[PDB]
Design an enzyme around this catalytic site. Structure first.
Site, short mmCIF file in Angstrom:
data_model
loop_
_atom_site.label_atom_id
_atom_site.label_comp_id
_atom_site.label_asym_id
_atom_site.label_seq_id
_atom_site.Cartn_x
_atom_site.Cartn_y
_atom_site.Cartn_z
CG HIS A 65 -5.79 -12.96 -3.23
ND1 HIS A 65 -6.42 -11.86 -2.42
CD2 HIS A 65 -4.72 -11.58 -4.51
CE1 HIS A 65 -6.24 -10.96 -2.67
NE2 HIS A 65 -5.58 -10.47 -4.16
CG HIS A 67 -5.47 -9.13 -8.30
ND1 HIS A 67 -4.42 -9.46 -7.57
CD2 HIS A 67 -6.25 -8.94 -8.69
CE1 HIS A 67 -3.74 -7.82 -7.91
NE2 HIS A 67 -5.51 -7.06 -8.17
CG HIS A 110 -2.19 -14.07 -7.90
ND1 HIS A 110 -1.80 -14.07 -6.43
CD2 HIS A 110 -2.84 -13.53 -7.94
CE1 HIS A 110 -2.29 -12.77 -6.15
NE2 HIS A 110 -2.76 -12.33 -7.29
CG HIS A 112 -0.78 -13.38 -1.43
ND1 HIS A 112 -0.38 -13.05 -1.27
CD2 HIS A 112 -2.17 -12.53 -2.70
CE1 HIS A 112 -0.72 -11.42 -1.76
NE2 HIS A 112 -0.83 -11.21 -2.40
CG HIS A 397 8.36 -0.36 -8.09
ND1 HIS A 397 8.54 -1.71 -7.64
CD2 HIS A 397 8.97 0.65 -8.22
CE1 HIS A 397 10.25 -1.74 -7.53
NE2 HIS A 397 10.04 -0.23 -7.41
CG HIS A 400 -3.59 -5.22 -5.51
ND1 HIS A 400 -4.46 -4.63 -5.71
CD2 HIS A 400 -2.89 -6.85 -5.29
CE1 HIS A 400 -5.74 -5.64 -5.56
NE2 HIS A 400 -4.97 -6.89 -5.07
CG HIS A 402 -5.03 -7.53 -0.76
ND1 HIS A 402 -4.84 -9.09 -0.46
CD2 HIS A 402 -4.10 -7.88 -1.79
CE1 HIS A 402 -4.17 -10.17 -0.86
NE2 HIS A 402 -3.23 -8.99 -1.56
CG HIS A 452 1.77 -6.73 -2.87
ND1 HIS A 452 1.44 -7.50 -3.89
CD2 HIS A 452 0.12 -7.11 -2.67
CE1 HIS A 452 0.81 -8.06 -3.65
NE2 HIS A 452 -0.33 -8.29 -2.83
CB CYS A 453 5.83 -4.06 -5.47
SG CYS A 453 5.78 -4.06 -7.04
CG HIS A 454 0.52 -8.16 -8.17
ND1 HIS A 454 1.02 -8.83 -8.60
CD2 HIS A 454 -1.09 -7.69 -7.36
CE1 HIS A 454 -0.22 -9.79 -8.04
NE2 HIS A 454 -1.26 -9.92 -7.57
CB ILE A 455 7.03 -6.97 -9.06
CG1 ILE A 455 6.44 -6.18 -10.75
CG2 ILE A 455 8.26 -7.47 -9.70
CD1 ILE A 455 7.78 -4.54 -10.98
CG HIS A 458 10.18 -5.91 -6.64
ND1 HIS A 458 9.61 -4.62 -7.57
CD2 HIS A 458 11.54 -6.56 -7.62
CE1 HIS A 458 10.79 -4.87 -8.65
NE2 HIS A 458 11.29 -5.42 -8.62
CG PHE A 463 8.44 -2.76 -2.61
CD1 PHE A 463 8.39 -1.20 -1.91
CD2 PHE A 463 8.25 -2.30 -3.97
CE1 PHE A 463 8.29 -0.61 -1.59
CE2 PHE A 463 8.95 -1.58 -3.77
CZ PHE A 463 9.05 0.01 -3.31
CU CU Z 1 8.26 -3.51 -7.37
CU CU Z 2 -3.29 -9.99 -7.27
CU CU Z 3 -5.28 -8.71 -4.37
#
Ligand code: CU
Ligand code: CU
Ligand code: CU
Ligand SMILES: *[C@@H]1O[C@H](CO)[C@@H](O[C@@H]2O[C@H](CO)[C@@H](O[C@@H]3O[C@H](CO)[C@@H](O)[C@H](O)[C@@H]3O)[C@H](O)[C@H]2NC(C)=O)[C@H](O)[C@H]1NC(C)=O
Ligand SMILES: *[C@@H]1O[C@H](CO)[C@@H](O[C@@H]2O[C@H](CO)[C@@H](O[C@@H]3O[C@H](CO)[C@@H](O)[C@H](O)[C@@H]3O)[C@H](O)[C@H]2NC(C)=O)[C@H](O)[C@H]1NC(C)=O
Ligand code: NA
Length: 499
Positions: A65, A67, A110, A112, A397, A400, A402, A452-455, A458, A463
Site C-alpha cells: 500500500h 499510504h 508498507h 498491507h 488509536h 486512517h 484510504h 482502520h486503526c493504524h496500530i 489492532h 479494528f
Molecule cells: Cu488501535
Molecule cells: Cu497505512
Molecule cells: Cu492508507
C-alpha cells in the site's frame, strides 16, 4: 539514491541487526527502512513489485500500500489484502501503475498483508512539488532530510498473540537505535547539517504501534506540512506523532556548531534515554565526532497541539457547522473485548474474495458484500461525517482512511469542534475516554476504501471496516489490468482455496 517513479522493487528475506540483535526480516530493496520511492506531483508511478520471499515464518505472500495516495480510478492498485487485491505469491511480480494528480507531500509505503510490515517492509514515499508554495522557507530538501521513526521487535510478527498488548524492543531513527533491554552501544544514526542553512525535515512515522514524543535538543521546529497537506507555519519544540502520520518541519541550523540529541520517546517500551536508547545525533559540519552532551527540558513549553494547525490553502470544511451537518452523518461504535476489536458490533476478518472483486462480479449493495456487516456503502458526491468516539482499550488509536484525506473537525482532548479552518490529514488520534474526534470528506472517489486503526496489531485483531464508496460507479471508474485479474486465481491455486 531515491528510486522511481518507474522502478522495480524486490521483496526479500535477510538478516538484519539495526539495534545489535540479529533477526530475519521482510525487506524492500534489501534495507530497513526500504529505499525512498520519489517523483513529482502528477507523475505516473509504475512500481513493479517482485515477491522473492521464501521464509514462511513472515509469510511468503505480499501486497504493498502507498499510504496517503488517493488512487482515484486505480482502486485496484491501493494494496490492502482482501480489500482491493489478492496477495502476490512468491516468484511472481505485479506492476502497481498509478498516477498522483493533485498531491504533493510526504508519504510512505508498507506491506498491507497481516502484520507483515512490522517484519520490515516499510519505506518513505515522497512526491515533490516543483512549484512548492513553501519552497522559499528552506534551502535543502532531499533524501538526507527524511527522518523515519520505527518500532522494532525481536520476536517475529506471526508469533505475536492476537489482540495482545505487544511491546517493542528498540526505537529506530533512520534505521538505527539501541535495544531497551540488554542494551549494547550499537551505532546511532547521524543527521548532518551546515551552520546557517535551513532544512525541510520530512518526519515519517513508520510505526506498527507506538506514538513518539519527537524533539531536537536546542532546536525548535516549524511545521509546514501535515500528512501531505501544506500548513501555515507553526513553531513547536516537541511533536507527538502517531503511527503512520507525517510532518514536514523547517529546521534552522542556528545553534552553535556541535552535537545535539534527537529524541523519540515511545508511549510503550523503554522510557528515557539511558544507554542512548530512543536517540539519534544531530551533527553540525565541523563538530567533533562524539556523542552530544545536551539535555532535554523537564517539560516542553510549546508542544504541538492539533487544533493549532491550519491549512496553507483555504480548504474550509464541507457541510454545515454543527454535529450531523452532512449528507451522510455516521457515528461508529468502536469497541474492544476478549482480544478482539469491533466496529458497529463486527470484528473485521478478511474475506476470501477481495471486496473490489466482489463488486466487479456484480454484488451491488453493501449487504451483499462480505464480510457481512464489515462493509458500509457511501453515496456519491456527498458530504460524509464520521464521529469516532474513543474508549476502546489500547488507545490512543490512530485511525486512517484510504482513498482520501479529511478535515479534522474535532481533535483529541478538546470537546470543541472547528467548522472553519481545521487541518486536513489522513491519520488522526481519536484520543481518550469521552472524546469525540470527528472527520469530514466528500465522496468523489469510487471504490472500496479501508478505514482502520493504524496500530497494526489492532487491525489484525479486527479494528477495521470498509467504506464501499459509490458502488454503482466502481466498475466504470476503475478499469482493471489483466495482471490484477490474474492475482486471485494464482493466489487461490497456490493456497488450495475454492472460489
Ligand atoms: Cu488501535
Ligand atoms: Cu497505512
Ligand atoms: Cu492508507
Ligand atoms: C459524538 O458526536 C455524535 C454526533 O456527531 C453524537 O451522535 C448523537 O448520538 C446521540 C446518542 O448518543 C443520538 O441521539 C440518539 O438517537 C437515537 C435515535 O437514533 C435515539 O433513539 C436516542 O434516544 C438518542 O436521541 C444522535 O442521533 C447522534 N447524532 C448522529 C449524527 O448520529 C455522539 O453521541 C457523540 N459521542 C460522544 C461520546 O460524545
Ligand atoms: C480547542 O479547540 C478549539 C477549536 O479548534 C480551539 O478554538 C479556536 O481557538 C482559536 C485560537 O484561539 C480561535 O481563533 C482565534 O480567533 C480569534 C477571533 O477571530 C482571533 O483573533 C485569534 O487570533 C484566533 O484566530 C478560534 O476562533 C477557536 N475556534 C472555536 C470554534 O472556538 C481551541 O483553542 C482549542 N483549545 C486549546 C486549549 O487549544
Ligand atoms: Na464550509
Amino acid at each position: 539514491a531515491q528510486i522511481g517513479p518507474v522502478t522495480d522493487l524486490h521483496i526479500t528475506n535477510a538478516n538484519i541487526s539495526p539495534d545489535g540483535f540479529s533477526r530475519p526480516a521482510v525487506l524492500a530493496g534489501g534495507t530497513f527502512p526500504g529505499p525512498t520511492i520519489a517523483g513529482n506531483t502528477g507523475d505516473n508511478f509504475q512500481i513493479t513489485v517482485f515477491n522473492d520471499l521464501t521464509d514462511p515464518s513472515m509469510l511468503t505472500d505480499t501486497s504493498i500500500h502507498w499510504h496517503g495516495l488517493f488512487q482515484k480510478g486505480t482502486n485496484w492498485a491501493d494494496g490492502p489484502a482482501f480489500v482491493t487485491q489478492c496477495p502476490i505469491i512468491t516468484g511472481q511480480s505485479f506492476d502497481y501503475n498509478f498516477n498522483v494528480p493533485g498531491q504533493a507531500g510526504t508519504f510512505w509505503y508498507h506491506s498491507h498483508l497481516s502484520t507483515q510490515y512490522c517484519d520490515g517492509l516499510r519505506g518513505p514515499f515522497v512526491v515533490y512539488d516543483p512549484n512548492d508554495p513553501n519552497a522559499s522557507l528552506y534551502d535543502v530538501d532531499d533524501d538526507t532530510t527524511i527522518i523515519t521513526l520505527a518500532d522494532w521487535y525481536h520476536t517475529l510478527a506471526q508469533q505475536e498473540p492476537i489482540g495482545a498488548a505487544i511491546t517493542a524492543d528498540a526505537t529506530l531513527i533512520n534505521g538505527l537505535g539501541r535495544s531497551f533491554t540488554n542494551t549494547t552501544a550499537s551505532p546511532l544514526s547521524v543527521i548532518t547539517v551546515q551552520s546557517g542553512k535551513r532544512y525541510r525535515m520530512r518526519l515519517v512515522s513508520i510505526s506498527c504501534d507506538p506514538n513518539y514524543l519527537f524533539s531536537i535538543d536546542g532546536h525548535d521546529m516549524t511545521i509546514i506540512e501535515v500528512d501531505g497537506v501544506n500548513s501555515q507555519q507553526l513553531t513547536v519544540d516537541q511533536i507527538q506523532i502517531f503511527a503512520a502520520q507525517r510532518y514536514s518541519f523547517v529546521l534552522n541550523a542556528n545553534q552553535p556548531v556541535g552535537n545535539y540529541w534527537i529524541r523519540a520517546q515511545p508511549n510503550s517500551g523503554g522510557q528515557g534515554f539511558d544507554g542512548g536508547i530512543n536517540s539519534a545525533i544531530l551533527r553540525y559540519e565541523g563538530a567533533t565526532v562524539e556523542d552530544p552532551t545536551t539535555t532535554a527540558p523537564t517539560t516542553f513549553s510549546n508542544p504541538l497541539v492539533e487544533t493549532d494547525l491550519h491549512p496553507l490553502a483555504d480548504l474550509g470544511v464541507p457541510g454545515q457547522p454543527f454535529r450531523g451537518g452532512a449528507d451522510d452523518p455516521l457515528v461508529l461504535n468502536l469497541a474492544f473485548a476478549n482480544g478482539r476489536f469491533s466496529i458497529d458490533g463486527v470484528s473485521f476478518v478478511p474475506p476470501t474474495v477481495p471486496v473490489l472483486l466482489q463488486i466487479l462480479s456484480g454484488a451491488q449493495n453493501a449487504q451483499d458484500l462480505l464480510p457481512a456487516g464489515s462493509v458500509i456503502s457511501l453515496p456519491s458526491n456527498s458530504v460524509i461525517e464520521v464521529a469516532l468516539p474513543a474508549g476502546a482499550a489500547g488507545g490512543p488509536h490512530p485511525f486512517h482512511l484510504h482513498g482520501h484525506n479529511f478535515a479534522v473537525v474535532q481533535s483529541a482532548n478538546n470537546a470543541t469542534p472547528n467548522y472553519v479552518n481545521p487541518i486536513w490529514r489522513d491519520t488522526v488520534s481519536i484520543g481518550g475516554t469521552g472524546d469525540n474526534v470527528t472527520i469530514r470528506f466528500t465522496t468523489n472517489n469510487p471504490g472500496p476504501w479501508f478505514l482502520h486503526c493504524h496500530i497494526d496489531w489492532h487491525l489484525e485483531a479486527g479494528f477495521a471496516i470498509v467504506f464501499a464508496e459509490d458502488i454503482p460507479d466502481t466498475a466504470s471508474a476503475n478499469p482493471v489490468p489483466q495482471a490484477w485479474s490474474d492475482l486471485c486465481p494464482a493466489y487461490d491455486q497456490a493456497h488450495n482455496i475454492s472460489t
